[PDB]
């Protein structure tokens, strides 16, 4: 399957508190592996997965230095953008940056990305060709003109197509026990009456990795996305995920309904049916 | 591994 390495950087201004709160996290696929918090004691990038712990002193010094440097530009940016939008110094605002790279299941480059948001909205982003920028408004245009003149795009592209994917491949190998595992979903069904012409069937998938998973309900072998209901996939907290889907059905039609579970851990799609 | 050394300001 495909893989990705992604980094997420958030800064929130805090008028009257002085410096903005800066939080950074890195991920491979669905697994977190580093963090930094401007307000924590260490002032270092910190490991959050065991496979990154094996990186030496130089690695950690490097990552720590880059992430701190990143917090400083985010802090400048919050002032600059405040000005661009003529906003009061009394309010708290947010800058977000995300970047990363994907690889195919051959582990060659598929795509790279780099995007930026101001107060939770798209601000500027590198297009897929990694040579050009899309800007959401005229503030963002001003940034685009600076970054074009600075040739930021070429630096990014050399990174995303080279370094990013090389280090991603390295993490997948070193962490292969964590990152190249699949944990197949454990599944079961619940039954609850409702309405009294109707009952709710809920199909459960627990303890699976990766997060990617497809649950559907069928009525007599027929795709049933019609008052069916899917919760957002949710982390169990132990590195696995959880999800369910629900269908509300006329009572005594229970047997007509089947739940279909697709997941990379499953050599074959599971079918479930209300049992007792 | 992060992009570096750093980014330009917006």
């Amino acid at each position, epitope marked *: 399957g495909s893989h990705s390495m992604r980094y997420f950087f958030t800064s929130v201004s805090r008028p009257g508190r002085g410096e903005p709160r800066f939080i950074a996290v890195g991920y491979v696929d669905d697994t977190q592996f580093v963090r930094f918090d401007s307000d924590a004691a260490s002032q270092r990038m910190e490991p959050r997965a065991p496979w990154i712990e094996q990186e030496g002193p130089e690695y950690w010094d490097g990552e720590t*230095r880059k992430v701190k440097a990143h917090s400083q530009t985010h802090r400048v940016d919050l002032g600059t953008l405040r000005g661009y939008y003529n906003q009061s110094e009394a309010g708290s605002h947010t800058v977000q940056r995300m970047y990363g790279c994907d690889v195919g299941s051959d582990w060659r480059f598929l795509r790279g990305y780099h995007q930026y948001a101001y107060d939770g909205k798209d601000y500027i982003a590198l297009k897929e060709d990694l040579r050009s920028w899309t800007a959401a408004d005229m503030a963002a245009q001003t940034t685009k003109h600076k970054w074009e003149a*600075a040739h930021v795009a070429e630096q990014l592209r050399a990174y995303l197509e080279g370094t990013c994917v090389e280090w991603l491949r390295r993490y997948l190998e070193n962490g292969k026990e964590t990152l190249q595992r699949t944990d197949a979903p454990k599944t079961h069904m619940t039954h609850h009456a409702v309405s009294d012409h109707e009952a709710t069937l809920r199909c459960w998938a627990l303890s699976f990795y990766p997060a990617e998973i497809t649950l559907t309900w069928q009525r007599d072998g027929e795709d049933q996305t019609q008052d069916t209901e899917l919760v957002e996939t949710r982390p169990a907290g132990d590195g696995t995920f959880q999800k369910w889907a629900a269908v509300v059905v006329p009572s005594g039609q229970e047997q007509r309904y089947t739940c279909h579970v697709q997941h990379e851990g499953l050599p074959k799609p599971l079918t479930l049916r209300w049992e007792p | 591994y992060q992009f570096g050394p750093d980014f330009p300001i917006a």
Partner: T-cell receptor, first 117, second 110 residues
Framework: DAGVIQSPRHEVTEMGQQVTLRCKPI?????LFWYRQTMMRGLELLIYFNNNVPIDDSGMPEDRFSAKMPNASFSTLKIQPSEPRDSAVYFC??????????????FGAGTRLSVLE | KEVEQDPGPLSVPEGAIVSLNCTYSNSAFQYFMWYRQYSRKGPELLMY????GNKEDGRFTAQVDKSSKYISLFIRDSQPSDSATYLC???????????FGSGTRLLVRP
């Protein structure tokens, strides 16, 4: 044309005293670098700052050397107590991201420091 | 992060091609530069290369071979005013910190 200003241009001093080297970066520049150069070690980075904060100080001597940037226009480097082996030319430089991407920085004229026994 | 460079000094006659080089051991270096320093002055950037081979500016050619970890600068048609110390420097992508060679003194004889 009017570049990085360093002070003093020359210093001849006795070991045991505090030495202060000063630099004002080019106006608008937001990186500042301190290097030293001797006969014995060649040319070496001591520290650099960005937005007034120290980013890399791996080249700082382990104890008599301290560098500060109180505001965007002023950096000092202090040696206390000074020793004859500190004798060197100290250069300060400043730059901007877009110049550093092409590996350009701008150097002051240096401070020539002799620390004598 | 050690870069080795021969001090020379080199003495060549005006019009000669000069060859300067450094070797290094850290495979993480990716940016390679040459500076000229006239005596009792600061260094002046001449040429810069990202990983990536060879480039030419006027009488100068800079080259990088990342497998042999060997970089060079060639100066065509050397002139007396090229007399100076020549220093290579390099870094990675994690810090703007430059690691320099010890320098090579060049005298071009008029």
């Amino acid at each position: 044309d009017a570049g990085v200003i360093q002070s003093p241009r020359h210093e001849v001093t006795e070991m045991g005293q505090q030495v202060t080297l000063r630099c004002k970066p080019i106006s608008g520049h937001d990186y500042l670098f301190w290097y030293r150069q001797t006969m014995m070690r060649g040319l070496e980075l001591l520290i650099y700052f960005n937005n007034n904060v120290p980013i890399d100080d791996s080249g700082m001597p382990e104890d008599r050397f301290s560098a500060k940037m109180p505001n965007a226009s002023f950096s000092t480097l202090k040696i206390q107590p000074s020793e004859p082996r500190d004798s060197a030319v100290y250069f300060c430089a400043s730059s901007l991201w877009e110049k550093l991407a092409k590996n350009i920085q701008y150097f002051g004229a240096g401070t020539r420091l002799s620390v004598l026994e | 992060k050690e870069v080795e460079q021969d001090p020379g000094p080199l003495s060549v006659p005006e019009g000669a091609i000069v060859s300067l080089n450094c070797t290094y051991s850290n495979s993480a270096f990716q940016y390679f530069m040459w500076y000229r320093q006239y005596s009792r002055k600061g260094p002046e950037l001449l040429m810069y290369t990202y990983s990536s081979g060879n480039k030419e500016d006027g009488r100068f050619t800079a080259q990088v071979d990342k497998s042999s970890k060997y970089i060079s600068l060639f100066i065509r048609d050397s002139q007396p005013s090229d007399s100076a110390t020549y220093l290579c420097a390099m870094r990675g992508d994690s810090s703007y910190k430059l690691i320099f060679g010890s320098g090579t003194r060049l005298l071009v004889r008029p």
